[PDB]
């Protein structure tokens, strides 16, 4: 997509249409071409299990990336890629780059992708205006296990309250609760305020 639908799908943090898979583990790519489905097992460079993306239809071209050769290289069996790299052409999924590459790469991705749409048609907005809105999209934590912290495992709570409770409980009884960062839209974040 492009234009206003692209801006909407970027700000509401939903799964894109033309989703492009990203590399899970840094390694050596083993591109086993199929009939109508590219199959690549990307051999790990440490010894881990083969992460395989399957059922990848032939609806789009491959990714033109740059390697040690210093030239625009198409994805062929023999190349080598690092963590967090699109394999085929399209747009990646923010919820996956989040976990793969930490919280900073998500904000980089979002600001860059929002600015490309506005810069294509020649509109100048400072980056400090999109950072204010991206800052509010990453403010909550999802509990995995609560232990004895008075939390329901699976809810969405603020980072400040989460760390305050985790510091209070360990200082007296002793139990750290679990939580991983999450990304929300602008409609689910507004309906979950404290008023």
From Swiss-Prot:
Induction and repression of expression: 6-fold repressed by starvation.
Origin superkingdom: Bacteria
Segments passing through the bilayer: none
Quaternary structure (record): The RNAP catalytic core consists of 2 alpha, 1 beta, 1 beta' and 1 omega subunit. When a sigma factor is associated with the core the holoenzyme is formed, which can initiate transcription.
Task of the protein: DNA-dependent RNA polymerase catalyzes the transcription of DNA into RNA using the four ribonucleoside triphosphates as substrates.
Family: Belongs to the RNA polymerase beta' chain family.
Protein name: DNA-directed RNA polymerase subunit beta'
Organism: Mycobacterium tuberculosis (strain ATCC 25618 / H37Rv)
Species lineage: Bacteria, Bacillati, Actinomycetota, Actinomycetes, Mycobacteriales
Name of the coding gene: rpoC
Shown residues within the full chain: 1025 to 1219 of 1316
